[PDB]
From a paper:
The systemic RNAi-defective (SID) transmembrane family member 2 ([name]) is a putative nucleic acid channel or transporter that plays essential roles in nucleic acid transport and lipid metabolism. Here, we report the cryo-electron microscopy (EM) structures of human [name], which forms a tightly packed dimer with extensive interactions mediated by two previously uncharacterized extracellular/luminal β-strand-rich domains and the unique transmembrane domain (TMD). The TMD of each [name] protomer contains eleven transmembrane helices (TMs), and no discernible nucleic acid conduction pathway has been identified within the TMD, suggesting that it may act as a transporter. Notably, [name] can hydrolyze C18 ceramide into sphingosine and fatty acid with a slow rate.
Residue numbers in the entry:
A (entry chain B), B (entry chain A): 24 to 259, 269 to 321, 457 to 601, 608 to 653, 685 to 823
């Protein structure tokens, strides 16, 4: 007649080799017994042998309630009208749940083409024996840009959230890992995948935190889809592309139940309400025996945070996805407690100055002669800024850590130098009792130029490297005697030891690097201040000296953890996600959160250097 | 046998009514003669009559080089697992260009289902006689969420850019208008549409500017896709949804060729190099006859601008899409020249102060007695700020107008009050020659609270309304005699006339509204300053008075155009795009760009009030 329609009764796990004309159509009738409980996923797999350029095979999979139709050799899209041609196509068949416990279910495969030559294909329908994922058990597979895959997970009895971790041992097939509910169809194509769910482009690691209140089915599909071009991960006639494949590994493990939150917050209070206990008991017994930054920052952040929450495109906020414990609508709630050190110490510092000035004033009322002529003259208008600034660093970082990003970046660390600036100002306002804000603004502007060029050319880096060493020998002679020539020994080597470290690494983060120059230069001056006392008639009581060794150590651990993550921020969040790590402390905090703890203790303990350093000069 | 396969030879523009079992499949063989030049688009259309709940029809359209397969009644997705069921499906068939001038082309339709009851459908394949769009000719059609449509445009001989304008007379089907190249397939589904191209959610208006350098085919497809739920436009068992349809209208018109740019830029220079000409000729003949805002602003903007340029999601930047002439990578280049008034007048102002102070200093060298005791004492450290501030308002608005948005919003107008503040400070520093920055920061913070609540509840508005009238009677008695009680007459009514206007409209924009309070309150004080002179022995020369009438008028036109668009910024850029308008002046500038022109002339002409107002007090 017009055409030829052949109706074979097909079988699972067998390979059929056949031929189709422009005048022949093949229909295969597969059938499987589905069970309500032990769902198994069917998976079709076709492969056209030595196809010419004439006309594709057209494959239709007809279930009871869905039609899925593709054409082999599949042709996929590049950026600039580039085409890729895959000879081998695979697809898992979505199928909805059943009201009966077990029932027989049919589906048909229809193979046809409109080319006048006998095309030979290779059809094999095989059942998946590893569909449903199990909690805490690794699993490996393969996928290409023509053969997307997806697996099922269903939450156990009494697990309210999991974290789907997917890893790969190599870089450049670029996968997308979407997470979708269990209602057919499954959006596992390059165009479909971004439609719904909450995805994550991966290169070596992806981690998605899932909570079963969003899934009334108590289950979800994990969908892995490779991409034709690697531009979104930092890479560089149809072009056959079947030679490019990706091996992966998926592990689903339960998240922290509820105690890591309670035992995490009872750790911040336990070591900062400890200082309040300590100083009060130390002071009591012994004695008688800015807004211009608050406004623009926050309202951008609230706008930016909800975007992912309402879109599920997790390439926006540069969290540490392996340790990011959500609470409410906050996706990294453990990076916000970490900023309790500033809010609880920058305030405690102010209380110290209050009573210090209040205790002082009574001496004038007592008509003390010392208060008028003995000791360095009082100036507590700068201490009230250091105490104020610290409290404002734990508020512009708690707002940065709601979506860390290239845009949001300057908010925290730029204000950090201000704190370091006041320490530099106070020492110079001490010895020479008779401005720098431009330099802090310049540094921010330089970091802004270092923000417009953070991944800037290495030519820019050596420009900064050269300029820094010029400013190294410039400020060297500003404060310049055997002891004086001792200064330039370390004052120039340490800066060399840092600028050189820049070229060896070229951290994509810049402002955070300048912070390293900040302390590493400043911390030297403290010694330069102390060596003045030791090599003169000046002395040190045990109260200030004790606050010198301790704070010189907490600046050691802090600068260690501040270095544990320094390159853990790159372009293309897919690359920046390769560096995430599990939670070190209490399984709630990681390296960075330790830095927010140690920095606030390093700084507060260096304020109480200045406060009591020149307190032996009273008499 | 196993099934029944019927092979009909079908015909165009006829309606076939047939039945299918779980044991019958229909195959229709359509054929059309395609021509290289006059491409016509085929369009299938199926409709299932009184379908039960059992099992869908499955439709496959098999061309020579593509398979398109759906299932009727189509089921579409809501937000929270809501399903919608369409009984009627339509689709235009994509088909690639032909190497022959004209050739016969076949395609098959396959109708089959797996339900055991005779389902009756209604298949009609009809050719489209209005496929290819023509330049400058309106065109109307219809579409639903099951029947997406797309049309073709190909650029004429010598037209380098067009603007696709689509309008609708009603609001709430939410369409998406993508623009894609002419390579099959066409992504005209809810999931596909966002994949590639450059789309725009519409409610009443959409306008996409297209440039044929991005399309080597010299043509593109305009794709219209309705949406099931109206949430993205501000709205509120499967639920049958075929009763909801959208009528549209598409007009493609050529953009400004090249002269609107040259004749636009030769308009900014012609009226600001005019002032330089004017004042120099007026002065010469007659006489002898901050950085803390530059850094955070810009680098966010460059990051934000390229996102649309690399994604084509034009619901991000709140341009005026009907008048937005691109140049380079800037999408609204006519909103950036408009800010040449500040850069060219805030600088000219400084030149005035220079020679004013330079001419002054020689009087002291000449040992003039007047310069020491006659006239109000000189203080040009505040004028050098007003001249500096103006130049910095035409730089934080030229950076805002690269993507206007809720986040980017505060950059320009917040700094505007600073300029108004110095004018208020100068007058009070004049009469009382012996701070407000907190109020400007508070206003920004209040506008920040008005930014966190811009669309805030009307309860918030009346709070501001009540508080403003309290501050109306508060500052009234600060500066308080028949003339003194004249002050409170207008000083309180005008503020009432504004706060009341707020409740009648409740503009979603807030900071811009506060600007209206800014001038409308400030502008009254100028009169309050002038009425002091007129009702005393004080006088006015013709040089200052001339600069009073003129600047009181340019504050009339400016506040007119500043009101022509005040609600033209809402939530959901689909709604905010209903308010766009064509270009008024030179077909390059619109209402807002006139405001950037008149504001800079209104301000500069009010500085030269203060400069020369009290210049009759010399002797
Ligand atoms: C369902 O498919 C199976 C194939 O897996 C069919 O079972 C075959 O039946 C034939 C005829 O008796 C025998 O070769 C075997 O019993 C089966 N073949 C196998 C297991 O390879 C079965 O007929 C199909 N069901 C229906 C209703 O057609
Ligand atoms: C993924 O693909 C790789 C091939 O790239 C598979 O590795 C092959 O299969 C087994 C397992 O090692 C060996 O017998 C072959 O020699 C392997 N080939 C190579 C080149 O290594 C791997 O098994 C696949 N992963 C699966 C099936 O889970
Ligand atoms: C292409 O389709 C057309 C239908 O539009 C077929 O033309 C029909 O041919 C029959 C047989 O002679 C006659 O009824 C008319 O000539 C046509 N019917 C119409 C116009 O309604 C034509 O046969 C098809 N071509 C092929 C090769 O099958
Ligand atoms: C879009 O649909 C409307 C119906 O909602 C069509 O209007 C109908 O068709 C013609 C044109 O006015 C009239 O004879 C009918 O009475 C109209 N019905 C109603 C209720 O107004 C309109 O024609 C369609 N647009 C097209 C086909 O371009
Ligand atoms: C296939 O078509 C040919 C026509 O040449 C003829 O043998 C018959 O119609 C069909 N036979 C089979 C086995 O399909
Ligand atoms: C199982 O499914 C069949 C349809 O194949 C249906 O007729 C039957 O009612 C179902 N079982 C029960 C217990 O309802
Ligand atoms: C293959 O093509 C030949 C034409 O040479 C034709 O006779 C034959 O029927 C086709 N199919 C097979 C299975 O040989
Ligand atoms: C349809 O199937 C029936 C079987 O009951 C039989 O008439 C024949 O096989 C087929 N007839 C037609 C016209 O398709
Ligand atoms: C027109 O198309 C046919 C295929 O149907 C092809 O054989 C022929 O070569 C084409 N015409 C020319 C001039 O190449
Ligand atoms: C409709 O269903 C009946 C069963 O009652 C069956 O006999 C018949 O073949 C079906 N088709 C038509 C066209 O009547
Ligand atoms: Zn931090
Ligand atoms: Zn503006």
């Amino acid at each position: 007649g017009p055409k030829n329609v052949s109706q074979k009764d097909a079988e699972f796990e067998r390979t059929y080799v056949d031929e189709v004309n422009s005048e022949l159509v093949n229909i295969y009738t597969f059938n499987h017994t589905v069970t309500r409980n032990r769902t198994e996923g069917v998976r079709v797999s076709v492969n056209v042998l030595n196809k010419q350029k004439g006309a594709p095979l057209l494959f239709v999979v007809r279930q009871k309630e869905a039609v899925v139709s593709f054409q082999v050799p599949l042709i996929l899209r590049g950026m600039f009208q580039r085409k890729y041609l895959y000879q081998k196509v695979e697809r898992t068949l979505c199928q909805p749940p059943t009201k009966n416990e077990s029932e027989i279910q049919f589906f048909y495969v229809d193979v046809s083409t409109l080319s006048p030559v006998n095309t030979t294909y290779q059809l094999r329908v095989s059942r998946m024996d590893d569909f449903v994922l199990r909690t805490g058990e690794q699993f490996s597979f393969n996928t290409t840009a023509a053969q997307p895959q997806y697996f099922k997970y269903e939450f156990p009895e009494g697990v309210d959230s999991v974290i789907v971790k997917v890893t790969s041992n190599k870089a450049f097939p670029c996968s997308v890992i979407s997470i979708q509910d269990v209602l057919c169809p499954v959006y596992d194509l390059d165009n479909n995948v971004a439609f719904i769910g909450m995805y994550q482009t991966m290169t070596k690691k992806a981690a998605i935190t899932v909570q079963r209140k969003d899934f009334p089915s108590n289950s979800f599909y994990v969908v892995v889809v490779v991409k034709t071009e690697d531009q979104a991960c930092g890479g560089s006639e149809p072009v056959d592309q079947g030679h490019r494949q990706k091996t992966l590994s998926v592990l689903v493990s339960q998240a922290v139940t509820s105690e890591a939150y309670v035992s995490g917050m009872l750790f911040c209070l336990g070591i900062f309400l400890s200082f309040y206990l300590l100083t009060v008991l130390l002071a009591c017994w012994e004695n008688w025996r800015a807004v211009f930054y608050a406004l623009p920052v926050v309202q951008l952040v609230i706008t930016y945070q909800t975007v992912v929450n309402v879109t599920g495109n997790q390439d926006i906020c540069y969290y540490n996805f392996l340790c990011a414990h959500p609470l409410g609508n906050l996706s990294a709630f453990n990076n916000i407690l970490s900023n309790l050190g500033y809010i609880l110490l920058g305030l405690l510092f102010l209380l110290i100055i209050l009573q210090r000035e209040i205790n002082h004033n009574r001496a004038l009322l007592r008509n003390d002669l010392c208060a008028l002529e003995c000791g360095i003259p009082k100036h507590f208008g700068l201490f009230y800024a250091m105490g104020t600034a610290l409290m404002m660093e734990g508020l512009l970082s708690a707002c940065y850590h709601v979506c860390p990003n290239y845009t949001n970046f300057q908010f925290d660390t730029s204000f950090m130098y201000m704190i370091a600036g006041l320490c530099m100002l106070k020492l110079y306002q001490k010895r020479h009792p008779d401005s720098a804000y431009a330099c802090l603004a310049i540094v921010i502007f330089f970091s802004v130029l270092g923000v417009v060029f953070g991944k800037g050319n290495t030519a820019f880096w050596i420009v900064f490297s050269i300029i820094h060493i010029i400013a190294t020998l410039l400020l060297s002679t500003q404060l310049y005697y055997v002891d004086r020539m001792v200064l330039l020994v370390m004052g120039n080597v340490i800066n060399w030891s840092l600028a050189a470290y820049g070229l060896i690494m070229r951290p994509n983060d810049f402002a955070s690097y300048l912070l390293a120059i900040g302390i590493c230069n400043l911390l030297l001056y403290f010694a330069f201040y102390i060596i003045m006392k030791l090599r003169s008639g000046e002395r040190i009581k045990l109260i200030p000296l004790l606050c010198i060794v301790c704070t010189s150590v907490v600046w050691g651990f802090a600068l260690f953890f501040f270095f544990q993550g320094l390159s853990t921020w790159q372009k293309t969040p897919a690359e920046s996600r390769e560096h995430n790590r599990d939670c070190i402390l209490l399984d709630f905090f990681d390296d960075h959160d330790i830095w927010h703890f140690l920095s606030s203790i390093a700084m507060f303990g260096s304020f109480l250097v200045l406060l009591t350093l020149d307190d032996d000069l009273d008499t």
